[PDB]
Design a protein around this ligand. Sequence first.
Ligand SMILES: CSc1cccc(Nc2ncc3cc(-c4c(Cl)cccc4Cl)c(=O)n(C)c3n2)c1
Length: 271
Amino acid sequence: YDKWEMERTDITMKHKLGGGQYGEVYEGVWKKYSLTVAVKTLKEDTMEVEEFLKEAAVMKEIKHPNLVQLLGVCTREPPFYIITEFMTYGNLLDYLRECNRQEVSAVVLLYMATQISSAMEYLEKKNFIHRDLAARNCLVGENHLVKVADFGLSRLMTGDTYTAHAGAKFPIKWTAPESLAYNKFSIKSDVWAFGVLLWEIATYGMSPYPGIDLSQVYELLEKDYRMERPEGCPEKVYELMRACWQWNPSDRPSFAEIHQAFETMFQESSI
Ligand SMILES: CSc1cccc(Nc2ncc3cc(-c4c(Cl)cccc4Cl)c(=O)n(C)c3n2)c1
């Protein structure tokens, strides 16, 4: 018995989301509650069923106000379904790039970084690591509400470090040194990515290391190169941005600390 298992009939598929950049995800309707939802689907021919099922499973364990919420699943017979709440404003990257900056202001940017750090602190305590933390994987809802995508989560079964399947490709500009070097990800690797995410938020969606060819990024980081403080970015925040980019992962702060710092900046800023 699985309280989550539901009827594939209850849902009404509509169209694809994010132009496919997230896979087989569509906007749907849950007839019963006339609720608009998000539906991840698995195709006919795939060796994904194993992974697809684990994602769903993981999602039944996580519950945080800033992590996308699972509503139900259809995993008995194909096509498989993972049903989640619907985020009306898409991903945080597009949101920042199109938003009105008089509305989505400094306090708002601060507020969004707090929410994301809040979710990461939850994941950190829960012993999970996120394999793709970036603005493009943060969803936005009304009132600058931000939730981190639950897809791409791995649970640390033993160590505090997760090794990815040898020969896996990850976003260079968001990947911590140790990950690019040895395919090893810890929560500290997420801290690094979070620091990059901060940079995206502070630049209203600019591409990280703009103009710098990928083949050079790792070396530049070795030689101690880091992105400069974005125009308008308060020093306190850049200082935290820089701490997230310590070369040694153990020198990087914990999400508990980062969250704490933001909760404070956010609060004293709203005064
Ligand atoms: C600009 S319009 C636009 C464009 C893209 C996206 C959205 N909204 C949205 N809302 C909710 C989701 C939920 C998921 C999801 C699912 Cl279906 C299963 C497991 C984990 C996650 Cl995070 C998802 O992948 N995506 C892309 C979602 N997207 C709106």
